[PDB]
Amino acid sequence: LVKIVRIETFPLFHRLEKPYGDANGFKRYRTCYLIRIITESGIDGWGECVDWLPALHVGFTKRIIPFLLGKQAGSRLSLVRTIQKWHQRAASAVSMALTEIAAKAADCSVCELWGGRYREEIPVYASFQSYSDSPQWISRSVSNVEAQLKKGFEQIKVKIGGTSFKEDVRHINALQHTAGSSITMILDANQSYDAAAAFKWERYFSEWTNIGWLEEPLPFDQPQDYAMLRSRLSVPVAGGENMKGPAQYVPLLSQRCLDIIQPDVMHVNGIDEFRDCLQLARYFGVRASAHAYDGSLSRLYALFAQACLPPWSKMKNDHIEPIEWDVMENPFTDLVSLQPSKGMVHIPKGKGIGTEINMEIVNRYKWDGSAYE
Amino acid sequence: ALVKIVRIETFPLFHRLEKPYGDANGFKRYRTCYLIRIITESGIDGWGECVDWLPALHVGFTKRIIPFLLGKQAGSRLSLVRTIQKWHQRAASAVSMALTEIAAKAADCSVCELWGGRYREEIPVYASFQSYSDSPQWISRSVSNVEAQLKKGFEQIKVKIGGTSFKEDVRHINALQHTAGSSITMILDANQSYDAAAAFKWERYFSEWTNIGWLEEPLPFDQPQDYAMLRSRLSVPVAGGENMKGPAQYVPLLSQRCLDIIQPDVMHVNGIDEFRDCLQLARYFGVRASAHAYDGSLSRLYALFAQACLPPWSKMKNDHIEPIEWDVMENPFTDLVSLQPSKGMVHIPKGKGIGTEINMEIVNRYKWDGSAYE
Amino acid sequence: ALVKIVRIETFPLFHRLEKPYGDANGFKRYRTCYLIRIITESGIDGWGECVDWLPALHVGFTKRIIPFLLGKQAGSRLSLVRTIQKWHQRAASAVSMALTEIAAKAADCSVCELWGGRYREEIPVYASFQSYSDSPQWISRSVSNVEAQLKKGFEQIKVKIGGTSFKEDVRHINALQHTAGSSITMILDANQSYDAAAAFKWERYFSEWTNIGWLEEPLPFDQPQDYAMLRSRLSVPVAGGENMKGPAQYVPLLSQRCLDIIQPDVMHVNGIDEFRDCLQLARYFGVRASAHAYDGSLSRLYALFAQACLPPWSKMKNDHIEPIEWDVMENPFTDLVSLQPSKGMVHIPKGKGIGTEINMEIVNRYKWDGSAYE
Amino acid sequence: ALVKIVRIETFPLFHRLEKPYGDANGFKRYRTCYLIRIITESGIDGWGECVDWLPALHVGFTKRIIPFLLGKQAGSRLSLVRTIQKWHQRAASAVSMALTEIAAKAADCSVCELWGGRYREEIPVYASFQSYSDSPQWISRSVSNVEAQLKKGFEQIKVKIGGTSFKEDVRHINALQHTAGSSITMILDANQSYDAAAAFKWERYFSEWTNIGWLEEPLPFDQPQDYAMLRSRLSVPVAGGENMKGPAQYVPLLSQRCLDIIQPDVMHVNGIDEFRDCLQLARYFGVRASAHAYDGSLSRLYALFAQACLPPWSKMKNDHIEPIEWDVMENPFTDLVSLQPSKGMVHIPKGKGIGTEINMEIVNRYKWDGSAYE
Ligand SMILES: [Cl-]
Ligand SMILES: [Mg+2]
Ligand SMILES: [Mg+2]
Ligand SMILES: [Mg+2]
Ligand SMILES: [Mg+2]
Numbered sequence A: 001l002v003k004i005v006r007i008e009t010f011p012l013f014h015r016l017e018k019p020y021g022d023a024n025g026f027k028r029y030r031t032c033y034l035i036r037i038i039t040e041s042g043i044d045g046w047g048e049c050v051d052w053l054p055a056l057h058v059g060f061t062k063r064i065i066p067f068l069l070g071k072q073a074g075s076r077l078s079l080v081r082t083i084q085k086w087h088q089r090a091a092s093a094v095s096m097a098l099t100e101i102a103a104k105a106a107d108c109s110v111c112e113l114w115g116g117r118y119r120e121e122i123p124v125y126a127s128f129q130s131y132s133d134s135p136q137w138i139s140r141s142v143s144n145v146e147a148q149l150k151k152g153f154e155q156i157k158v159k160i161g162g163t164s165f166k167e168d169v170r171h172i173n174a175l176q177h178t179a180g181s182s183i184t185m186i187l188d189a190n191q192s193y194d195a196a197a198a199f200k201w202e203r204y205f206s207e208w209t210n211i212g213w214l215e216e217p218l219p220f221d222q223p224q225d226y227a228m229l230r231s232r233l234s235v236p237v238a239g240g241e242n243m244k245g246p247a248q249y250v251p252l253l254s255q256r257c258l259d260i261i262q263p264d265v266m267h268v269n270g271i272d273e274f275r276d277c278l279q280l281a282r283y284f285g286v287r288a289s290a291h292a293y294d295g296s297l298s299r300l301y302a303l304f305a306q307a308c309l310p311p312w313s314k315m316k317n318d319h320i321e322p323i324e325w326d327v328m329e330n331p332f333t334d335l336v337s338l339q340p341s342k343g344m345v346h347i348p349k350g351k352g353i354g355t356e357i358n359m360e361i362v363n364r365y366k367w368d369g370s371a372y373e
Numbered sequence B, C, D: 001a002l003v004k005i006v007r008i009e010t011f012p013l014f015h016r017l018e019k020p021y022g023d024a025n026g027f028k029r030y031r032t033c034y035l036i037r038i039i040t041e042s043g044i045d046g047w048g049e050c051v052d053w054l055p056a057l058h059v060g061f062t063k064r065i066i067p068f069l070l071g072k073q074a075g076s077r078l079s080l081v082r083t084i085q086k087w088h089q090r091a092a093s094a095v096s097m098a099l100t101e102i103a104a105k106a107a108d109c110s111v112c113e114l115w116g117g118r119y120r121e122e123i124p125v126y127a128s129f130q131s132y133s134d135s136p137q138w139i140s141r142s143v144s145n146v147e148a149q150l151k152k153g154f155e156q157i158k159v160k161i162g163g164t165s166f167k168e169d170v171r172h173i174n175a176l177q178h179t180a181g182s183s184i185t186m187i188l189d190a191n192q193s194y195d196a197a198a199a200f201k202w203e204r205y206f207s208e209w210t211n212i213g214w215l216e217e218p219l220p221f222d223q224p225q226d227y228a229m230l231r232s233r234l235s236v237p238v239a240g241g242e243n244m245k246g247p248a249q250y251v252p253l254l255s256q257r258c259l260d261i262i263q264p265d266v267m268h269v270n271g272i273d274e275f276r277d278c279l280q281l282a283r284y285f286g287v288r289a290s291a292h293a294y295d296g297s298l299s300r301l302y303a304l305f306a307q308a309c310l311p312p313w314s315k316m317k318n319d320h321i322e323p324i325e326w327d328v329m330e331n332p333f334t335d336l337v338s339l340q341p342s343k344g345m346v347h348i349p350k351g352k353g354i355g356t357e358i359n360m361e362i363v364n365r366y367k368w369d370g371s372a373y374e
Helices: A053-068 A076-086 A088-105 A137-150 A165-179 A195-199 A223-232 A246-254 A271-284 A297-307 A331-335 A359-364 B054-069 B077-087 B089-107 B138-150 B166-180 B196-200 B224-233 B247-255 B272-285 B298-308 B360-365 C054-069 C077-087 C089-106 C138-151 C166-180 C196-200 C224-231 C247-255 C271-285 C298-308 C360-365 D054-069 D077-087 D089-106 D138-151 D166-180 D196-200 D224-233 D247-255 D272-285 D298-308 D360-365
Strands: A004-022 A025-039 A044-049 A121-127 A155-159 A184-188 A211-215 A237-239 A323-326 A344-346 B005-023 B026-040 B045-050 B122-128 B156-160 B185-189 B212-216 B238-240 B324-327 B345-347 C005-023 C026-040 C045-050 C122-128 C156-160 C185-189 C212-216 C238-240 C324-327 C345-347 D005-023 D026-040 D045-050 D122-128 D156-160 D185-189 D212-216 D238-240 D324-327 D345-347
Touching (some): A004 A359, A025 A053, A053 A076, A053 A088, A076 A088, A137 A155, A137 A165, A155 A165, A165 A184, A195 A223, A223 A237, A223 A246, A271 A297, A331 A359, B054 B089, B089 B298, B138 B166, B156 B166, B166 B185, B196 B224, C005 C054, C026 C054, C045 C089, C054 C077, C077 C271, C138 C156, C156 C166, C156 C212, C166 C185, C224 C247, C247 C271, C271 D272, D005 D054, D005 D360, D045 D089, D045 D298, D054 D077, D077 D272, D166 D185, D224 D247, D247 D272, D298 D324
Parallel strands (some): B185 B212
Antiparallel strands (some): A004 A025, A121 A344, B026 B045, C026 C045, D005 D026, D026 D045
């Protein structure tokens, strides 16, 4: 029934019309790497991962597909654990394919397979790559955000830390003026700062009522500086987008470094370990808001996991964290037909993942095999 | 699916011991079991098991938990269990178990496959004894009770200490050592009898012995810092936590480095999902986890499934999965499911749902008469 | 100079093992090596070596790294290595070596001279084993392997523990102890097999034995406080950190007193300049540093240069510089650079550049055929 | 090279101040400077600079350091500098400078190239003031003196506090604030005048001001935890460490989280390589580093080379390298090298060696007569 018989892979690539950036620099293209695992009985499932395409593609064709062929698709935990040793990026796409196969074989949704959802709607924030290579970048950023406010998003993430304090403050004042205090604003510094540089924002944090949090102001090599900065700031501190699993969050949580952890399904070892990241935060008494700069199919899994998470508070209408919703130019958001209405996502409830991968997008963006660069 | 809960049946069971046996908390005079059967619209059913004082347990189910469950969707396990947790902690595990059976039968797979597939099919167990008895010859009764289990190929045992003077406990353990020898692993369970100085008196023996597996719950857990202090001074691992209600209670113990081994019990934690989370929390922290199970047959089977679905704790080809406790004291409820170790290993059922049936003969024979032992 | 990189050559190498060997992570089936040759406008060239799965590595060079390097000034070594590190940390390492050779030949001096001159000309090494093999007779094979290298006049060895039970591992080490005797230093390498309690089991032999150099990476590194706790309980030093990418990673460990000895690896950290920083960091912390080098030949030569340029860690006239790891298992790549210890001491080449030549016969013989090992 | 040291010349220099100035340690009455020139066999030479009381500095060099240095290999810089460090801290730095210049020259490259290549060629600087003068009009003079340098395009300044009442210093700093305005970065240097309570009195001003670069050395360094406590209470960064002898002294300050910015002085640490290690060490700890240079011109040039070779501390495209200290008080030795800011930026010379020459006119003009000041 569930022996693995065939696996198809789909490296996808899109060069950006107009580049955009954060403190790490300008982005020039978006990529994505889908796999389809098919079992003896015909039951199939899809997974997604992200990494530089030439290496990722050879990893799959030379090692992972060779290894998965003939294996029992029902031995999810075991197979993912073995791949995680060679290649953690791939383990995650594998774990998602295998879950969809489990759900379908069980004749239920992924949410049901995990023990039933708590809710049908998940809040998301609009996430922007605020810089662009234009002396008019501030005014482009304002236009961009305006556009999304019109769509009814109530929360936003924008970028700081890539130009001087004076310049970034000017930008965020400009956003405060347009947005107003009913819009929650998240500021992401992409680890540009040290504690003293991040502390400069405190004089603005004191007077602003709408900052949702300050994201990764620092690098993570010194956990004690995060616990120090966090104790000095008037807004929550979030982070952890690059952590590989619950084992790396534990010492951060034990050391009270963060208000909000931010695992990414495609950065951790599998959708089972990602769900463990979320519960772990629940058990430490801290929040968890999934990170998803890249992600479409994996973003659907973060949505299913968030729907199966118990509330973090007793507040009747503020008891579950939003998930990140990239709103920049990215044709891979349409790999699955699912988009927020007024900043809420309505979770698919049909069998499997309750929706289909959109082959027009898969075929439209087939990687031609050459390196940009 | 959208299938509703339509009936729940309850089976309180009771057995008065022929000969009492004990630990540091005193003599046990009886054993008990409380089973439930949840039946859905489609006739799919599942069983759970819990333990607590029978009269209060029985009314928790009949006057609140069952009335609440009737009409609910059996597939809403996470949510139903979470609400029940708030009214009756002990009942949540039983409910969670029975909904898990339902889920696995509904999906036409075993419990372990529901969880993502097992890593192994054999789980090691230790023989767990209530070594105190009501008699001046209790040391010798202990020794032959132990002897009798060693003949069945158990390679590890748990015996009790802290119930009597240090001197007399030493005598007993010394006797067991002379009989068992260095190749049997010995766990000493103090049942929270000691303070740090009292526990430490054992260290002059832990120095010399080479087969002590761990020292179990030497102290109460009010002061976590006293564990990390004791742990640091002793030559054997310290285990504990059989009363913790779930992973949120373990987290500060493991942050403070209080324990080498945690010991969650299915029927003491918040549901089988939370129980699995305790085990994985232990792995994320780098500590071992060996399930506690003084009571339990059906819940112990779930602890076996959980352990089978847990990654190894070490890279030792021969020693990378923790044992689970196997109570070997008189208890007819050990047979509620027909599964027993052979040479100190239990082979996991692979069939659909729980891969096994509950013995209705034992159910009816030990039906509780509804009267309190006192 | 303003001098530009005009050509880059790549040499991935592969060798399938005749007899597998291993550690707690399992058996090794092949060894590989990846060299590069960077050629400048003036014809000055420099070589580098890295390690990683070859399909991926090869494509990273041919598709990203080489395209970026062509036309860059070979003299902007810090700047270039830092760029490459963000993408590909393994590759930056090979790149830094190539550029360092070029700097030294352009300056008409040796690498050590380029760095301010060596403190010494001889560096001690220890013979390093992959002790496990696919055999019921693996212990006596390891004993025979160890005997052989001891006749070469190695005075220290590292062997593997953690891959099988504590009792079997101890039989292995006791066999070694009987054959070597107490004048040979023995390092035990657990490869992150253990948790603190399993590691601590060795303490009762540590107390008795007098020739243990250190216990190597007994635990994973996710919980630094577990290292600090364990280190405080053992009678031998603790060493680790072969997987750390650079000084930044080591700082929290050292602040928290996790380790007696840090073990950076040239090919695991971000280039040779950061590796040397990992060394000095240790000296500033008052802790020892002994380079890791399971794989490595050309890059092991750089760890040798770096050790020769390192201040003494002690005032002991004849015990003041740490040894480096010398892999003694079947590896034809040990001969890419023609350099071997005598009686456990390596005598550093003193000539221009790296003061030695790469053996092209080995490059040409072990050319990778392009396929993966299924 | 095996090229030997054949000749060392020394140049004690002295200038009496036309008008004194100072800080909380009192008024300065003269400037000194002490150059050395080391000549090798092949006739490649190099210069170094140090500072201390001339009489003792002079006999140190003439009777011990010079005798030791003749006949030695100019290439053994690490080794030679380490030995000197033992008897004469301050002299080691001047020697390490000369030998570096010799090294680059023999390499046919600049110093920055020798170190692995610059990241950037312009370095920001701050105008550094000794704000107290012997006069009841000292405030309006400070204001004037500051104004003259703003007119020259410095965008950052350091001034002295802690030598008079809080009330009087605040009046001086308010006047400075009002003239400079919020586009000028102001640094307040307390020269260890205060305890934590007196430093904290400033916080109510720091609350309001937007342009404070940092509070420098507000306390003595005997109690690192008091720096950690203070740092955590103030609204502006804390810097210090100008008298640390090297990386090993900064390490516990950084592990304890005492400082936002360390300030090693090339002439206070054990040589230029050890100085580079201080900067790199701040990087690895996630802290900033801003070179101290009250005295210094040749040494300040090396401090400038080192900063050009340091990676960025932030991802801010316009704000990612720390400025360095530029003394703007009367001192004729600022022209020993012909290098001056333009609009608060120094463009780094790029020629071979130090890429500039010592101005012998200055050297000859200020020859010390051998007398001691009163
Ligand atoms: Cl590691
Ligand atoms: Mg982020
Ligand atoms: Mg217990
Ligand atoms: Mg190692
Ligand atoms: Mg100062």
